[PDB]
Structure formats: structure tokens, C-alpha cells
Design a protein around this nucleic acid. Structure first.
Lengths: 43, 159, 115, 131, 59, 84, 89
RNA sequence: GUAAGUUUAGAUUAUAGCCAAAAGAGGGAGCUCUUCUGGAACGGAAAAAACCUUUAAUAGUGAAUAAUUAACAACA
């Protein structure tokens, strides 16, 4: 046994590098348009 | 109009749209061509952090360097002793990934980890529901446990 | 139910892939339902056959006495014919036997993907 | 002569209770047992919720790429992929590029599967449908 | 990838604005879609306590 | 068009089978947005009302901002757990 | 390592490498007029994006994008090869 | 197929059910009786002691299933 306290462990996994390919955000997988035109822009 | 011709309408055409697959002969060439490029990538070692999925016990653990994994049972292995995981179905790189069918060849992937600690789980209260329960009808568990630290992941261009 | 159900016909033979000659020797039976709330005669037969646990394979002889017992519990069991593609296992190969879901007991387990 | 400590055993579990329950042994003992039983029942149900959460997250990730969860699972099964739902959630969150590759793989098998189903097996099995 | 922690949290937890046209459209089908978008169920990391709902505009 | 999904948003997915046939190779290099398909950064450079203003800014309920009694305030855990 | 003025430092490295200073562009925009605006700013070198960062304001996104570029410059990518402690040699 | 059984001696406990569903009998509704069968979830039928799925209970951030409110105007 180690000196670490014996109590409930919330998560059985510990990692210092959770993501390798990058964390997903809503703008991921969203296609751009020519000139980056925002929606409903008349131009 | 040709015989048995149905004009397109709401009900004449199915909602789903038919697709056409590429011809097999050229498809294999693309399959082989892609493999050759990847084989060079593995040989050149053009990758950094890697993630590998390993199935241990009844659990599947996505694993990376320095990861800590806890197993809720004894293992009989001394602490500080490196161990090789033999069940890996997937390994991933920054710009490519490999998928087992259903498992990767032992030659391609070798994964090693070290045993950190042997411990028992925190107490777990068990008390069944019953009329006139009484206070002494309760049980504790503290299921044994073990700690594993990921050490290294080794791959080779053996496609 | 007519007795023809247990008297097979050529069409039934083709459907289930069973040869009218060389009748199969052994039955494979598994309990698929609970005996709770069932009459005592059903309960007694299930215990006698040993199908206490559900989804547990049991091998039985295809003999008239056993067939009568299986018929009583027919609704609570699934019956499959055991097949020996490689024949009976030997003493040396007794440790390499494996029973497939198809109903075939192989006498050699090579741990190689069939693919 | 240890009756005081027996009450302390109930009290120590009842220190965090509110109202006269925390200071009345008659009520404190009942509350302590009720609290323990509630945890016991939740243990079995707790596991089921976690799987439900994992499945729900997978569906949103699959729907983000335009793939239905049932279709994605079936095609992966046809490909002999046995990654668990918990790992699948992590892959989408932490390996979005891999998830798209998985999404592309499942869709390609789905296209091959639809072709195979329409073919009825007369046509040769597809490259991605080969076992 | 390689983004700073605080900006990374902001982007993933950000809420989006959506526009819907109701002309000759069944409200119920729009409501089913609107509920999905409004509740935040369209996000892969949806959690009950994350308050990840999104803005929906209907015209 | 070997890939079954559009490759123009996240990454170029190239699916391949290894020579042995018991492995699938996926190559996924990321795709960058075209210069033409983006815009340049913009070159030009009381108690009751307080809760209402707070509610309006964050689209929250007014009930959220009301205080709580001493009983619950003391109960709050002072040390939220954070590892790494 | 404390780095102030990331944009200036990024430009300083680029001129040393004889690389054109990237042209900042607004890759994505959301909730601009709300109290919680999200801006994505991408650094485009020779009309090619080198690094992109998210920010609540255009300035914040540009600063974050600069920080991302600096990590890329010095090979500190999030996906970089992990250091190895296993080697007995 | 299976492992109890017969006899001798000592000795108590028990000697009041509940509800569903079957089979009868008075009766002509429904009631009124008698007989046989089954039951006491941690799942489901909404809340449902009595119906359906359910062999015990142990830890696990595994897996396959069971039962599981739902159904798709008339003219010759």
C-alpha cells in the first residue's frame, strides 16, 4: 500500500494529455463560404 | 415513353438516394497507394502523441503515454514491474489511425505498462430494503484494487 | 395439436436441414423462461432435466423417454441437434473441444480466426 | 456502560442532518438507516444511467457528422468493431479527426451494406465489406 | 489543438444563434427540431448541468 | 471520391486496407480554410433593477441572483477538488 | 515560460526566418452584438493560415492565435511526441 | 431421468389465510356457493401485496437479451 488516502475516487482515469487531435468545438465541421460571408449578408 | 415508365413524383421516387461505388480494380490501387504513403509515414516517424485502445478485464481503456489506470482487483504482480498489454484493437496518430480486424497483429504493436500500487476500494455500504430493517443488516465491501502506469507504446512499419 | 407435428415430412426436413434417415442422436436444450407461476408438473420436469439456470446448454439423448420429457417442457426450451463434424473427441483431444452456436462440437480448437 | 458511544455511532452519521432529527436519537437512527439504504439502491441504477449518458453523447456526436446512432452502430458491428460506448464518447471529444474517419468508415460500409442488401449476395463483397 | 485552456473552454461552451423560417411549415416538426436546438442536444458533449442551450430565431 | 463522407470541413479522410487485409488504414490530414473564404479582421476600431440587468445580460432568471441564508452559505465546500 | 507581447515576438521570429508577417483574418464569428461574443482570428501568411485562435474579442483571438503560433514555432504542439522516461540508457 | 425411501423410537410445530385465473353447481343479469391452478421484483402493465418478464447475491465508469399503450365517411 501507498501513503495515498483510501476514499472514494470520482474517476478511475488520470491523464495529463486528454486530447491529441484537438478538442471539439461547435465551429468544427462547419464549412466556410467565399469571402467568409456571414448568413443573410446581401453584400 | 418506354415500357414500364413511371414519371417521377412524390411517391414514384424513394426518399433515399442511390449511390454508385467505384470500380473494384482501381479501388484496390487507391487502397494500396494509400497504404504505401502511410507506410512511409510510419517509417519516417511523422507522429507525436498517440492513443491506443486496449481491452483489459471487461473494460476497454483508451490509453496514452503516462496514463494511470486502476483495476478493481489484485493482479499478483510486484509494484514497479513492467507488464505488456496484449489486447489492442486501435492505435491512433495525429494524421492517421490503424484499426484491428478485430485486433492488430502482435508484431505491429507492443504496449508496456508498470504496476504502481496494490490497494482495496473505499468501503461500499450494502443494505437491502425490508420491513423492520434493523440497524445491523448492512455490509461493507472494500473490493481489492491495483494501479497501473503506462510506460511506452512501440510500433513499426510492418504493414 | 396434430401428432403430425412430431412426424416429420420431406418439406420440414428441407426447411430445417435434417435428413429423414440417420436421425440425430443428441438434443441441445436451453431454458428460455421462468418456471415461476407455472404448474407443478412443469416445474418438476424442468428440475429433472437440470435446466435450473436459463440460457444454460444441456445435452440430452434423442430417445423416446427423453423425447416425452422434452415434449412436456417444449414451450420453455429451444431444441437443437448436436453435430460432430470431426467425430467424437479422443482422450488426447478432450482438452481441445469447443461447442459452436451452430450446434457443432469441434474436437480441435486452434484459436485462429476463421475470417 | 457504552450506551453513550452507541448513540455517538448514530450521531456521527447524523451530525450533518438538519432539524430535531440530528439531535434526537429516535429520529436520528431512522434517518441514518434511510440514508444508507438509498445509496444501496442507487448503485445498481447508477451503472445504467452512465450507459444512457454515453449513448446519448454518441448520438449527438454522430448527428453532428450527420450519422444516426443506430446506423453507425450496425455498420461498426458489420465491420467487427468492438469499441465500447464509453470509449466512443472519448474518441469524438478528443479525436474529432478520428471520429470523422470512423464516420466515413461507417458510411462507406453503410453504402456497401445497402449495395450488398440490394445485390442479395450475388455481387462480390465490397472491399470494405470483405472479411 | 494547442489552444490555451481558458479560450478552449470558452469556444466549446459557447452558444450559437440559429434562424428558422416557418412559412408553410408544420410547427410541430419545427418544434421537435427547435427543442433539440434549444435544449442543446445538438452538441456532442451535451450534459444536463452544462446549460449548453442555443439561441433559436423563428420567423 | 473514395471517401464516403465530405472531406472539406474537418480533414481529408483516405480509407485503405493493408496488404494482409486484417487492418484498415485511415489518413486524416487537417484542412485549412481558404483565404478567399474568410473575412478580414474588422479594420475599423438599484437592487431591483440590478437583478433585472443581471438577468437580461445572461438570459437567466431573477430568482438566481437573490441571496441565500447563512445555513446554506456555511455548508458550501471551501476546497473544490482539482487534480492537475 | 513567460512571454509578453506575443504578436511582436511572433513577428520578430518571422523576420528572422525571412517569413512574411501573417495577415489577420476573421475566420468565424458568433454572437457579435451580444454580451457573450465569440471571435475566431486566423493568422494568414502569404494568404495561408498558420495559426488560429478563439477569443471573446478580435484582439483576444489575435493574441490567442499568436500564442498558438509561438508553440508551433518552437515545436510545442499539443500533439507533439511525448518525452520518454522509460529509456534505461 | 434421477436420490432418496421403508420401518422403529422420541418430540414438538401446525390445526384461522389473501387475491387472481380455471372447472362445476344453484341462476336466467350478475350475483351464491364448491373444486383445481398460481402468486408475494430489485423490470413492466401509470399509481397496481395477488397479472406479465424474472433461479440466489458480490464489486466493476463492461456486454447480449426478457417483459415492457399503443392502433393505423361507405358505393356497388
Amino acid at each position: 500500500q501507498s501513503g495515498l488516502d483510501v476514499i472514494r475516487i470520482r474517476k478511475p482515469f488520470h491523464t495529463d494529455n486528454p486530447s491529441i487531435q484537438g478538442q471539439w468545438h461547435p465551429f468544427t465541421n462547419k464549412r466556410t463560404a467565399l469571402h467568409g460571408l456571414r448568413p443573410r449578408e446581401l453584400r | 415513353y418506354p415500357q414500364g415508365y413511371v414519371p417521377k413524383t412524390s411517391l414514384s421516387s424513394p426518399p433515399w438516394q442511390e449511390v454508385v461505388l467505384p470500380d473494384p480494380v482501381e479501388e484496390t490501387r487507391h487502397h494500396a497507394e494509400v497504404v504505401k504513403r502511410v507506410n512511409e509515414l510510419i517509417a519516417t516517424g511523422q507522429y507525436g502523441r498517440l492513443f491506443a485502445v486496449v481491452h483489459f478485464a471487461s473494460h476497454q481503456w483508451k490509453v496514452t503515454a503516462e496514463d494511470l489506470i486502476l483495476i478493481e482487483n489484485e493482479l499478483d504482480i510486484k509494484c514497479g514491474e513492467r507488464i505488456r498489454l496484449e489486447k489492442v484493437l486501435l492505435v491512433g496518430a495525429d494524421n492517421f489511425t490503424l484499426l484491428g480486424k478485430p485486433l492488430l497483429r502482435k508484431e505491429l504493436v507492443r504496449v508496456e505498462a508498470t504496476v504502481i500500487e496494490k490497494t482495496e476500494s473505499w468501503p461500499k455500504i450494502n443494505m437491502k430494503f425490508r420491513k423492520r430493517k434493523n440497524f445491523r443488516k448492512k455490509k461493507i465491501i472494500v473490493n481489492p484494487q491495483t494501479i497501473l502506469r503506462i510506460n511506452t507504446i512501440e510500433i513499426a512499419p510492418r504493414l | 395439436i396434430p401428432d403430425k407435428v412430431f412426424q416429420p415430412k420431406p418439406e420440414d426436413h428441407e426447411k430445417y436441414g435434417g435428413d429423414p434417415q440417420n436421425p440425430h442422436k443428441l438434443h441441445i436444450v436451453t431454458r428460455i423462461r421462468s418456471t415461476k407461476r407455472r404448474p407443478y408438473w412443469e416445474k418438476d420436469t424442468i428440475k429433472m432435466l437440470g435446466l435450473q439456470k436459463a440460457h444454460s446448454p444441456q445435452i440430452h439423448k434423442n430417445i423416446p423417454s427423453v423425447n416425452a420429457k422434452l415434449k412436456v417442457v417444449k414451450h420453455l426450451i429451444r431444441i437443437q441437434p448436436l453435430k460432430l463434424p470431426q467425430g467424437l473427441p479422443t482422450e488426447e483431444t478432450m482438452s481441445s473441444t469447443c461447442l459452436k452456436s451452430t450446434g457443432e462440437l469441434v474436437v480441435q480448437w486452434h484459436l485462429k480466426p476463421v475470417e | 456502560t457504552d450506551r453513550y458511544w452507541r448513540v455517538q455511532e448514530v450521531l456521527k452519521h447524523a451530525q450533518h442532518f438538519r432539524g430535531r432529527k440530528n439531535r434526537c436519537y429516535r429520529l436520528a437512527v431512522r434517518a441514518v438507516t434511510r440514508a444508507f439504504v438509498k445509496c444501496t439502491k442507487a448503485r445498481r441504477l447508477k451503472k445504467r444511467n452512465l450507459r444512457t449518458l454515453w449513448i446519448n453523447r454518441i448520438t449527438a456526436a454522430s448527428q453532428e457528422h450527420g450519422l444516426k446512432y443506430p446506423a453507425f452502430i450496425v455498420n461498426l458491428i458489420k465491420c467487427q468493431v468492438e469499441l465500447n460506448r464509453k470509449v466512443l464518447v472519448d474518441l469524438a471529444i478528443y479525436e474529432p479527426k478520428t471520429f470523422k474517419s470512423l464516420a466515413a468508415l461507417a458510411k462507406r460500409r453503410q453504402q456497401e451494406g445497402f449495395a450488398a442488401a440490394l445485390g442479395d449476395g450475388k455481387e462480390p463483397e465490397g472491399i470494405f465489406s470483405r472479411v | 489543438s494547442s489552444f490555451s485552456r481558458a479560450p478552449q473552454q470558452w469556444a466549446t461552451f459557447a452558444r450559437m444563434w440559429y434562424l428558422l423560417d416557418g412559412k408553410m411549415q408544420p410547427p410541430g416538426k419545427l418544434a421537435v427540431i427547435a427543442s433539440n436546438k434549444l435544449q442543446g442536444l445538438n452538441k456532442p458533449v451535451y450534459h444536463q448541468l452544462s446549460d449548453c442551450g442555443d439561441h433559436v430565431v423563428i420567423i | 471520391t473514395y471517401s464516403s463522407l465530405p472531406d472539406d470541413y474537418n480533414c481529408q479522410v483516405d480509407l485503405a486496407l493493408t496488404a494482409d487485409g486484417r487492418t484498415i488504414v485511415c489518413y486524416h490530414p487537417s484542412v485549412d480554410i481558404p483565404y478567399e473564404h474568410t473575412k478580414p479582421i474588422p479594420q475599423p476600431d438599484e437592487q431591483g433593477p440590478m437583478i433585472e440587468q443581471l438577468s437580461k445580460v445572461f438570459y437567466t432568471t431573477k430568482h438566481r441572483w437573490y441571496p441565500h441564508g447563512q445555513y446554506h452559505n456555511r455548508r458550501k465546500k471551501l476546497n473544490p477538488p482539482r487534480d492537475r | 515560460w513567460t512571454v509578453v507581447n506575443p504578436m511582436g515576438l511572433l513577428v520578430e521570429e518571422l523576420k528572422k526566418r525571412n517569413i512574411s508577417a501573417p495577415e489577420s483574418r476573421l475566420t468565424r464569428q458568433s454572437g457579435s452584438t451580444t454580451a457573450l461574443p465569440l471571435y475566431f482570428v486566423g493568422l494568414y501568411c502569404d494568404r495561408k493560415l498558420i495559426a488560429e485562435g478563439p477569443g471573446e474579442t478580435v484582439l483576444v483571438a489575435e493574441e490567442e492565435a499568436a500564442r498558438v503560433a509561438l508553440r508551433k514555432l518552437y515545436g510545442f504542439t499539443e500533439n507533439r511526441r511525448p518525452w520518454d522516461y522509460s529509456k534505461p540508457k
